[PDB]
Amino acid sequence: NARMDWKETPEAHVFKADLPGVKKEEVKVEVEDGNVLVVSGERTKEKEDKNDKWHRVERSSGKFVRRFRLLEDAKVEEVKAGLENGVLTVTVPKAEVKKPEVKAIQISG
Amino acid sequence: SIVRRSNVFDPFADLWADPFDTFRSIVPAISGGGSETAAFANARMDWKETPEAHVFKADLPGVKKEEVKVEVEDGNVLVVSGERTKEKEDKNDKWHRVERSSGKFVRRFRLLEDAKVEEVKAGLENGVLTVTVPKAEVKKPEVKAIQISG
Amino acid sequence: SIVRRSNVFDPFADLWADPFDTFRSIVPAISGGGSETAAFANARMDWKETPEAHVFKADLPGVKKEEVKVEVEDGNVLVVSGERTKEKEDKNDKWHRVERSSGKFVRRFRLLEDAKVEEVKAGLENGVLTVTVPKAEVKKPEVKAIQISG
Amino acid sequence: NARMDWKETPEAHVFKADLPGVKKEEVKVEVEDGNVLVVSGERTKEKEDKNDKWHRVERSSGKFVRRFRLLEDAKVEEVKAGLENGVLTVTVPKAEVKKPEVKAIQISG
Amino acid sequence: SIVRRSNVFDPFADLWADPFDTFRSIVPAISGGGSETAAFANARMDWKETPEAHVFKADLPGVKKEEVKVEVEDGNVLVVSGERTKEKEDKNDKWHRVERSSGKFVRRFRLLEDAKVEEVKAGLENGVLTVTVPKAEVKKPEVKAIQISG
Amino acid sequence: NARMDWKETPEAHVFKADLPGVKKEEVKVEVEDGNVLVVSGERTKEKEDKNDKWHRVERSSGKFVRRFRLLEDAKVEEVKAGLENGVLTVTVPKAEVKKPEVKAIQISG
Amino acid sequence: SIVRRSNVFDPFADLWADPFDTFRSIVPAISGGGSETAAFANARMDWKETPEAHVFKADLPGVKKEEVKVEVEDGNVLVVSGERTKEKEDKNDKWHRVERSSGKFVRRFRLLEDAKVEEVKAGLENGVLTVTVPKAEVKKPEVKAIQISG
Amino acid sequence: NARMDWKETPEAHVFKADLPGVKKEEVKVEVEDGNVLVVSGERTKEKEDKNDKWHRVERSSGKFVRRFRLLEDAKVEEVKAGLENGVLTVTVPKAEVKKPEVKAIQISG
Amino acid sequence: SIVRRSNVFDPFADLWADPFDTFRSIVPAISGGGSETAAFANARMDWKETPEAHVFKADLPGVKKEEVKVEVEDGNVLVVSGERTKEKEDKNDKWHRVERSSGKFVRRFRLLEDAKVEEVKAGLENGVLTVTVPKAEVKKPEVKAIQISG
Amino acid sequence: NARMDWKETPEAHVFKADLPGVKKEEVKVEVEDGNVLVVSGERTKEKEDKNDKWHRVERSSGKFVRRFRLLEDAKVEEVKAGLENGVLTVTVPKAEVKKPEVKAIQISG
Amino acid sequence: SIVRRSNVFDPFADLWADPFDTFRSIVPAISGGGSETAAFANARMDWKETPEAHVFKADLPGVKKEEVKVEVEDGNVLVVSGERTKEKEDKNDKWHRVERSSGKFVRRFRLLEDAKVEEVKAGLENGVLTVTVPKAEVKKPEVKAIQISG
Amino acid sequence: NARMDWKETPEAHVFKADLPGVKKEEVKVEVEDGNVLVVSGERTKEKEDKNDKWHRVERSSGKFVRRFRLLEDAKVEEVKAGLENGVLTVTVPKAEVKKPEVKAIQISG
């Protein structure tokens, strides 16, 4: 289970993914079927030796797969992917810069 | 499993037309994709529809208005989001027990009718956010009662 | 809970984007409305998508073609329905045990692309209905691989 | 749990409901909010006396509620409701008679 | 797992003497053999024993008497079976939703006493089948109350 | 799970089994311990290739086993087995033709 | 719920012909009557049928033959009962932890054929009771294979 | 849940029932339908006052019902019922004294 | 999983401070170690704290005082143990059904205050063991009520 | 379920509790048995009228109870309790001001 | 249910000596008190004991060292706490989906031996916090093997 | 699951374990980490041949592991282990013979 956020900037749709303990050689970022962002990889289990003793185990390991459907008109050739401090960031440029229409409301009452 | 759009709660969605079919279909898919339920927990919300308006409630204890946001998108989508700030309390304190653990979150609801954004009221009080959305007048088109032959 | 349209299975529906949220939301609504799952049991079906076409399978043991119907609605909705006829077998026979109990049923799937109805093939054999829907040619637009900086 | 079918004829949308053991005085057929068909009633439990003894109980009892959303242009004033042999039938006339578009396919293979 | 005879419901069977032992023993065997529960669903039935007779009820909505059968076997076995006919309704109709899906089925009950077949009454009304089986007279042999010493 | 019916004719006990997608080479019909009818076989899974994509899977596959205890006096050497349209039929001849005793009752009320 | 006779395990009982029906019927009756499962726990047993004989195993750790009893009733009912004696160990000892807690119990199995009681062997070793019941010779009446037409 | 044993002596069928904390005024021993032994009563809950505080609760309370089917030929008028040290004992005399047929086997091996 | 000391029930143990954390942590460890729950079943007990004393109840039907033991360890640990003797009833009797199956067992509770052993009363009656432990006098230090500002 | 934090300052132990929608007249702050802090109250359910319609309900209501064991030497008479913005704060003064012993460690690696 | 001290994970606690008893006791108390499990979710941790040292791992994705704290209390209690800061990212951005929702949290473990605080190493890398606690040398006092008589 | 008792005599702590069907060659008794009693072994499953038929299976098989923490001052070199009639007995001598302090109470009431 890789937790991911999906935010939109006037310039692009940005995806974030918590991938603690994953080296960039274990993560794959692609675009399938022309418009499907696919983030996948493996969180390798550190099996080790029998000399060891486990008192607690809460961290998960194994394969992870995440898919988001991008716009039929997205800069598929301009998608960037960065990995730092256990967080993956994918930047999918938008065909044309333009902040989304959102009308804010005042809070008080 | 492909996320294509944002999660917008709609009380008239078709997934509610056959609960068991829906149930039967997702139980096998629980161990997949991702979920916002954890994040959702930071903002338990109620949605009531009185004849006069739609009233939403959100438990946002210890949250300041500068940390919450109520917007309207595409004419009929109420959006509530925010993030409780770090308590600028004594750096160095000893934390014996910490249950209150809130974070970022975003919620959306599909209104039954396009809302008149200038009429939407939002107030924060005693940790409870309240969003009132005034509906348009209608005589609840009277109820038709059919006599059962046979 | 209001039924507004027919149940059309769509593999890209949004209910699959957050399985647990969906799960969490309907479990409390199971004891409501109605369900076609019982009827659905008379036609367990598979849907496979090979690069060349969409292939549907339906277990319809002991059913005759005059009792099954494969139609296409609104350009992209495959519809499978029918009802196994009463076995015109010896009136007066003693029924020790009866498990095979099939009835009426209707199923719908939302195709990814409008189908060329004259190209759709449907065959019934050994109790298995097979519906093949030819897709249009595409080079599977190549897969783009992004080098991960950082 | 009242089981209901929803069929469409060129002339109207027809609804069927299994309501065994229900007298027409216990069933209500209405149209709420202008276009929502509401079928409800109660399947009264025959409590009886303590002299009795129950060896098997599979039949349900209690309240039932069913709602379907009709077309914004349906003969709401022309809806009929019949009850016979434990089956309820509701006929919602369509604004304009017209069989639905359905292209049948041949089975053989 | 070997089926040797027909399923005859008996309220005095020994499987009821130790519910948990029975429970404990079959849970591991659920994934085996076959079951008539699906078929049974087409005829939910009640069995009441008033002092005067045994009364059975069966929900058979939309069923015609020519489709139901009430027989008596081996002196003390009530048998109810049938199959709701296909609704000879407009061939070509569009099926939006189909939940009502009934089929063939057979049910048997072991009467406490051989029944006088000519006294058994069976009526079908408002979708409910009713089978009344007159018992023989007895003074309910009085109840003996033992004084508890000690 | 192979669904089976067990009917009795004056001439024989007839068994039916839903076996969609099963070729007669995958089904076995036998009589064990002298009087136990055994219907078994496999509903082969069409594993296929990874080029494929599954959108829905409701049909079962694998092994199935069904056993019925015949009469100590049944034409064990005269049992027939037919397979057509996904339905298996086994005919176990009775030692002596004779319709079972069944007293029908009138329905009306 | 009325106990009428002793619990005799029979592998060919009819309750096994429809596991789910049986399951479905007792789950609602678990909160009733009584149960010997607790007592049964003092003697977990296996029953194997080799071509030569019926072999029963019973875990009876720390039990002495004078405390166990293997009998045969009504020609075809194996009966195993007993009660582990109190350990005549140091009266006054401190009991830190006690998991081994065995008591009285009786178990019965319905043999497929009347047993020749003088041929039944019973041995106790390493806490395991073993009861061997010699069957009569038979050529396993050969298996008949029916060619499937159609 | 009242735990009961059912033993048979050459003279009668003896039933035992654990009924801790039950006074003989709360237990009823009867014979219904001519041959059904019915043991029932209530294990009254000591509700008490709110001044109290419960640290552990494992003992059950409420109604209990137990039924055994006696022989169509049992001394129904000679059934005795004793209650001592939380254990109820019911003695149902047999029509004719006679130890049950039981063939014991030797243990050794 | 290492057993280091005897199981002593303490109502103020820390495992009760976070039920779900405790729950969440042991569910995965159920299939391990051993358990006294079976043995515990032979002595269901209640512990009530009236202002005047601690009252323990134990269902020990058919048990004689020479078979039960109430001791006090390390100043504040009530200990209840025993073992119902074999009913010296007719050797040769036929056991139709045996549910009452009690065995050895030991239970311990951590008193809130060291008990004055000479003041502890223990009585056995109608199958119920009762242990009363007199507490020391205190005025329940009055309850302080804080006025809530803000 | 009222979520509470328990922090310790050199001067006192501070407790926090999320109590959205609770007026100070519905909350009670006390000290039982001399050293047990008891926070309790009710989150009243706004039942309202049947004219209303509920589309979503996630917020809880009802009674809540929370207990913490203070030190046998705590300023029980100096405990303060404040309620603001749905958060309750209880300040339990310590017998003698004194930051707790805690040795911090450097993070880097 | 009274919280008296902070939750300190101890692998040798007595609650692990009888999993089922513990389980059996808290299931009924789940609907009470409060829980830190939600908060705990922000820092899933592993604890491994190699012969050379105790190694703890904590998934703290996107967390900066100025937001995490590793301390040692009362000689043998490792404490890990923190709170991921708000992403000072574009104020005004549209949040389509938010699953990553972390908050404040504190965790404690009871070391088997008092740790030499100046030897404890803590590093943060790729979202994973690692705390190594060097143990003192010992020859693992050899394993004694007892020959089983009897 | 190997059931074990833990009793204490003035001379030693005695452990008992139900191990029916286990030969002494399949059981291991040791002392790890200097003071941890470890009882382990396997209850071998008698797989046998396919000619066989199983009508009932309640007995368990497989590996079992049990650990008790002895006193830092226990005659670790004087631990005995006996196996008879499916019951294992381990005797851990105490540094100094001495019955535990236990004050008995009178039962009557």
PDB file of N, CA, C and O in Angstrom, chain L residues 56-97:
ATOM      1  N   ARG L  56     -12.918 -39.092  10.576  1.00  0.00           N
ATOM      2  CA  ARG L  56     -12.867 -38.062  11.599  1.00  0.00           C
ATOM      3  C   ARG L  56     -11.418 -37.726  11.916  1.00  0.00           C
ATOM      4  O   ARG L  56     -10.562 -38.610  11.985  1.00  0.00           O
ATOM      5  N   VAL L  57     -11.144 -36.442  12.101  1.00  0.00           N
ATOM      6  CA  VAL L  57      -9.798 -35.997  12.416  1.00  0.00           C
ATOM      7  C   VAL L  57      -9.888 -34.826  13.384  1.00  0.00           C
ATOM      8  O   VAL L  57     -10.334 -33.742  13.008  1.00  0.00           O
ATOM      9  N   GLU L  58      -9.472 -35.046  14.631  1.00  0.00           N
ATOM     10  CA  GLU L  58      -9.519 -34.002  15.643  1.00  0.00           C
ATOM     11  C   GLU L  58      -8.161 -33.798  16.280  1.00  0.00           C
ATOM     12  O   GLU L  58      -7.892 -32.760  16.884  1.00  0.00           O
ATOM     13  N   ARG L  59      -7.299 -34.794  16.149  1.00  0.00           N
ATOM     14  CA  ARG L  59      -5.983 -34.704  16.746  1.00  0.00           C
ATOM     15  C   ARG L  59      -5.046 -33.822  15.928  1.00  0.00           C
ATOM     16  O   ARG L  59      -5.025 -33.883  14.700  1.00  0.00           O
ATOM     17  N   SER L  60      -4.273 -32.991  16.615  1.00  0.00           N
ATOM     18  CA  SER L  60      -3.349 -32.096  15.936  1.00  0.00           C
ATOM     19  C   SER L  60      -1.986 -32.741  15.730  1.00  0.00           C
ATOM     20  O   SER L  60      -1.670 -33.762  16.331  1.00  0.00           O
ATOM     21  N   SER L  61      -1.186 -32.137  14.861  1.00  0.00           N
ATOM     22  CA  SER L  61       0.153 -32.626  14.575  1.00  0.00           C
ATOM     23  C   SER L  61       1.007 -31.426  14.195  1.00  0.00           C
ATOM     24  O   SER L  61       0.489 -30.334  13.956  1.00  0.00           O
ATOM     25  N   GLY L  62       2.317 -31.627  14.145  1.00  0.00           N
ATOM     26  CA  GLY L  62       3.197 -30.534  13.793  1.00  0.00           C
ATOM     27  C   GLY L  62       4.154 -30.158  14.904  1.00  0.00           C
ATOM     28  O   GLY L  62       4.377 -30.923  15.844  1.00  0.00           O
ATOM     29  N   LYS L  63       4.713 -28.960  14.793  1.00  0.00           N
ATOM     30  CA  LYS L  63       5.673 -28.461  15.765  1.00  0.00           C
ATOM     31  C   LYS L  63       5.022 -27.781  16.956  1.00  0.00           C
ATOM     32  O   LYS L  63       3.944 -27.210  16.834  1.00  0.00           O
ATOM     33  N   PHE L  64       5.687 -27.864  18.107  1.00  0.00           N
ATOM     34  CA  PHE L  64       5.222 -27.210  19.325  1.00  0.00           C
ATOM     35  C   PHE L  64       6.428 -26.567  20.011  1.00  0.00           C
ATOM     36  O   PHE L  64       7.540 -27.088  19.945  1.00  0.00           O
ATOM     37  N   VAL L  65       6.204 -25.424  20.647  1.00  0.00           N
ATOM     38  CA  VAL L  65       7.265 -24.699  21.332  1.00  0.00           C
ATOM     39  C   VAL L  65       6.759 -24.071  22.623  1.00  0.00           C
ATOM     40  O   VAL L  65       5.769 -23.352  22.609  1.00  0.00           O
ATOM     41  N   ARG L  66       7.447 -24.325  23.731  1.00  0.00           N
ATOM     42  CA  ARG L  66       7.052 -23.736  25.004  1.00  0.00           C
ATOM     43  C   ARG L  66       8.231 -23.172  25.773  1.00  0.00           C
ATOM     44  O   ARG L  66       9.251 -23.840  25.935  1.00  0.00           O
ATOM     45  N   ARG L  67       8.079 -21.941  26.256  1.00  0.00           N
ATOM     46  CA  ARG L  67       9.144 -21.264  26.982  1.00  0.00           C
ATOM     47  C   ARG L  67       8.729 -20.690  28.337  1.00  0.00           C
ATOM     48  O   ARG L  67       7.721 -20.000  28.450  1.00  0.00           O
ATOM     49  N   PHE L  68       9.521 -20.968  29.363  1.00  0.00           N
ATOM     50  CA  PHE L  68       9.262 -20.435  30.696  1.00  0.00           C
ATOM     51  C   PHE L  68      10.554 -19.797  31.158  1.00  0.00           C
ATOM     52  O   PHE L  68      11.636 -20.303  30.868  1.00  0.00           O
ATOM     53  N   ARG L  69      10.453 -18.679  31.864  1.00  0.00           N
ATOM     54  CA  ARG L  69      11.645 -18.011  32.362  1.00  0.00           C
ATOM     55  C   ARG L  69      11.933 -18.486  33.783  1.00  0.00           C
ATOM     56  O   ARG L  69      11.158 -18.227  34.705  1.00  0.00           O
ATOM     57  N   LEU L  70      13.046 -19.196  33.945  1.00  0.00           N
ATOM     58  CA  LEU L  70      13.453 -19.710  35.247  1.00  0.00           C
ATOM     59  C   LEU L  70      14.096 -18.587  36.055  1.00  0.00           C
ATOM     60  O   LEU L  70      14.298 -17.483  35.545  1.00  0.00           O
ATOM     61  N   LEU L  71      14.419 -18.869  37.313  1.00  0.00           N
ATOM     62  CA  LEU L  71      15.052 -17.876  38.176  1.00  0.00           C
ATOM     63  C   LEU L  71      16.519 -17.685  37.809  1.00  0.00           C
ATOM     64  O   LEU L  71      17.195 -18.637  37.421  1.00  0.00           O
ATOM     65  N   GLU L  72      17.007 -16.452  37.935  1.00  0.00           N
ATOM     66  CA  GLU L  72      18.404 -16.144  37.636  1.00  0.00           C
ATOM     67  C   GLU L  72      19.326 -16.994  38.512  1.00  0.00           C
ATOM     68  O   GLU L  72      20.533 -17.053  38.281  1.00  0.00           O
ATOM     69  N   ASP L  73      18.743 -17.649  39.515  1.00  0.00           N
ATOM     70  CA  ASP L  73      19.495 -18.511  40.424  1.00  0.00           C
ATOM     71  C   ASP L  73      18.803 -19.871  40.557  1.00  0.00           C
ATOM     72  O   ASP L  73      18.256 -20.217  41.606  1.00  0.00           O
ATOM     73  N   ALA L  74      18.824 -20.639  39.475  1.00  0.00           N
ATOM     74  CA  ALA L  74      18.208 -21.958  39.462  1.00  0.00           C
ATOM     75  C   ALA L  74      19.259 -22.974  39.053  1.00  0.00           C
ATOM     76  O   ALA L  74      20.147 -22.671  38.259  1.00  0.00           O
ATOM     77  N   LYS L  75      19.159 -24.178  39.604  1.00  0.00           N
ATOM     78  CA  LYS L  75      20.106 -25.240  39.298  1.00  0.00           C
ATOM     79  C   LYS L  75      20.004 -25.662  37.832  1.00  0.00           C
ATOM     80  O   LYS L  75      19.620 -26.792  37.528  1.00  0.00           O
ATOM     81  N   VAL L  76      20.359 -24.747  36.932  1.00  0.00           N
ATOM     82  CA  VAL L  76      20.310 -24.992  35.494  1.00  0.00           C
ATOM     83  C   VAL L  76      21.016 -26.281  35.061  1.00  0.00           C
ATOM     84  O   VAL L  76      20.643 -26.896  34.062  1.00  0.00           O
ATOM     85  N   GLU L  77      22.034 -26.690  35.809  1.00  0.00           N
ATOM     86  CA  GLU L  77      22.766 -27.911  35.489  1.00  0.00           C
ATOM     87  C   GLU L  77      22.111 -29.133  36.117  1.00  0.00           C
ATOM     88  O   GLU L  77      22.527 -30.261  35.863  1.00  0.00           O
ATOM     89  N   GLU L  78      21.090 -28.912  36.938  1.00  0.00           N
ATOM     90  CA  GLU L  78      20.408 -30.016  37.606  1.00  0.00           C
ATOM     91  C   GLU L  78      18.970 -30.245  37.154  1.00  0.00           C
ATOM     92  O   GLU L  78      18.196 -30.911  37.843  1.00  0.00           O
ATOM     93  N   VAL L  79      18.616 -29.701  35.994  1.00  0.00           N
ATOM     94  CA  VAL L  79      17.268 -29.863  35.459  1.00  0.00           C
ATOM     95  C   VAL L  79      17.084 -31.268  34.897  1.00  0.00           C
ATOM     96  O   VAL L  79      17.888 -31.731  34.090  1.00  0.00           O
ATOM     97  N   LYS L  80      16.030 -31.948  35.327  1.00  0.00           N
ATOM     98  CA  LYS L  80      15.756 -33.292  34.839  1.00  0.00           C
ATOM     99  C   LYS L  80      14.533 -33.232  33.938  1.00  0.00           C
ATOM    100  O   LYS L  80      13.726 -32.310  34.036  1.00  0.00           O
ATOM    101  N   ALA L  81      14.397 -34.218  33.063  1.00  0.00           N
ATOM    102  CA  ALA L  81      13.266 -34.267  32.154  1.00  0.00           C
ATOM    103  C   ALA L  81      12.850 -35.711  31.942  1.00  0.00           C
ATOM    104  O   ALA L  81      13.634 -36.526  31.464  1.00  0.00           O
ATOM    105  N   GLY L  82      11.613 -36.022  32.312  1.00  0.00           N
ATOM    106  CA  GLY L  82      11.108 -37.370  32.152  1.00  0.00           C
ATOM    107  C   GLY L  82       9.896 -37.386  31.245  1.00  0.00           C
ATOM    108  O   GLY L  82       9.139 -36.417  31.197  1.00  0.00           O
ATOM    109  N   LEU L  83       9.710 -38.483  30.519  1.00  0.00           N
ATOM    110  CA  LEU L  83       8.577 -38.615  29.611  1.00  0.00           C
ATOM    111  C   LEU L  83       7.917 -39.966  29.798  1.00  0.00           C
ATOM    112  O   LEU L  83       8.535 -40.997  29.562  1.00  0.00           O
ATOM    113  N   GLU L  84       6.656 -39.957  30.214  1.00  0.00           N
ATOM    114  CA  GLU L  84       5.923 -41.196  30.430  1.00  0.00           C
ATOM    115  C   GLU L  84       4.426 -41.012  30.234  1.00  0.00           C
ATOM    116  O   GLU L  84       3.849 -40.027  30.681  1.00  0.00           O
ATOM    117  N   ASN L  85       3.806 -41.970  29.558  1.00  0.00           N
ATOM    118  CA  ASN L  85       2.370 -41.934  29.299  1.00  0.00           C
ATOM    119  C   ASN L  85       1.907 -40.620  28.667  1.00  0.00           C
ATOM    120  O   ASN L  85       0.897 -40.042  29.072  1.00  0.00           O
ATOM    121  N   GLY L  86       2.654 -40.155  27.673  1.00  0.00           N
ATOM    122  CA  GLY L  86       2.293 -38.931  26.989  1.00  0.00           C
ATOM    123  C   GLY L  86       2.427 -37.654  27.792  1.00  0.00           C
ATOM    124  O   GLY L  86       1.950 -36.605  27.359  1.00  0.00           O
ATOM    125  N   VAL L  87       3.061 -37.725  28.957  1.00  0.00           N
ATOM    126  CA  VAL L  87       3.250 -36.532  29.782  1.00  0.00           C
ATOM    127  C   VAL L  87       4.723 -36.286  30.076  1.00  0.00           C
ATOM    128  O   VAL L  87       5.421 -37.166  30.586  1.00  0.00           O
ATOM    129  N   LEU L  88       5.188 -35.085  29.744  1.00  0.00           N
ATOM    130  CA  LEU L  88       6.574 -34.697  29.974  1.00  0.00           C
ATOM    131  C   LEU L  88       6.680 -33.960  31.308  1.00  0.00           C
ATOM    132  O   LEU L  88       5.841 -33.124  31.634  1.00  0.00           O
ATOM    133  N   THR L  89       7.709 -34.276  32.081  1.00  0.00           N
ATOM    134  CA  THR L  89       7.911 -33.630  33.368  1.00  0.00           C
ATOM    135  C   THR L  89       9.322 -33.077  33.469  1.00  0.00           C
ATOM    136  O   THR L  89      10.297 -33.804  33.286  1.00  0.00           O
ATOM    137  N   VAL L  90       9.428 -31.785  33.748  1.00  0.00           N
ATOM    138  CA  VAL L  90      10.724 -31.142  33.876  1.00  0.00           C
ATOM    139  C   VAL L  90      10.872 -30.633  35.304  1.00  0.00           C
ATOM    140  O   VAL L  90      10.011 -29.910  35.807  1.00  0.00           O
ATOM    141  N   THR L  91      11.967 -31.017  35.954  1.00  0.00           N
ATOM    142  CA  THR L  91      12.210 -30.619  37.332  1.00  0.00           C
ATOM    143  C   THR L  91      13.371 -29.648  37.437  1.00  0.00           C
ATOM    144  O   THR L  91      14.526 -30.024  37.236  1.00  0.00           O
ATOM    145  N   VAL L  92      13.065 -28.396  37.757  1.00  0.00           N
ATOM    146  CA  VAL L  92      14.101 -27.383  37.889  1.00  0.00           C
ATOM    147  C   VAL L  92      14.379 -27.105  39.360  1.00  0.00           C
ATOM    148  O   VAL L  92      13.635 -26.379  40.015  1.00  0.00           O
ATOM    149  N   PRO L  93      15.462 -27.688  39.898  1.00  0.00           N
ATOM    150  CA  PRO L  93      15.862 -27.518  41.301  1.00  0.00           C
ATOM    151  C   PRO L  93      16.036 -26.055  41.697  1.00  0.00           C
ATOM    152  O   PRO L  93      16.560 -25.253  40.927  1.00  0.00           O
ATOM    153  N   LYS L  94      15.600 -25.715  42.904  1.00  0.00           N
ATOM    154  CA  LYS L  94      15.714 -24.347  43.393  1.00  0.00           C
ATOM    155  C   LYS L  94      17.022 -24.168  44.157  1.00  0.00           C
ATOM    156  O   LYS L  94      17.484 -25.081  44.838  1.00  0.00           O
ATOM    157  N   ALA L  95      17.617 -22.986  44.035  1.00  0.00           N
ATOM    158  CA  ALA L  95      18.880 -22.693  44.705  1.00  0.00           C
ATOM    159  C   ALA L  95      18.871 -23.144  46.160  1.00  0.00           C
ATOM    160  O   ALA L  95      19.873 -23.661  46.664  1.00  0.00           O
ATOM    161  N   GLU L  96      17.743 -22.950  46.837  1.00  0.00           N
ATOM    162  CA  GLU L  96      17.638 -23.333  48.239  1.00  0.00           C
ATOM    163  C   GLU L  96      16.219 -23.743  48.616  1.00  0.00           C
ATOM    164  O   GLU L  96      15.299 -22.929  48.594  1.00  0.00           O
ATOM    165  N   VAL L  97      16.059 -25.019  48.958  1.00  0.00           N
ATOM    166  CA  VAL L  97      14.770 -25.577  49.350  1.00  0.00           C
ATOM    167  C   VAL L  97      14.028 -24.629  50.282  1.00  0.00           C
ATOM    168  O   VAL L  97      14.597 -24.156  51.263  1.00  0.00           O
TER     169      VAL L  97
END
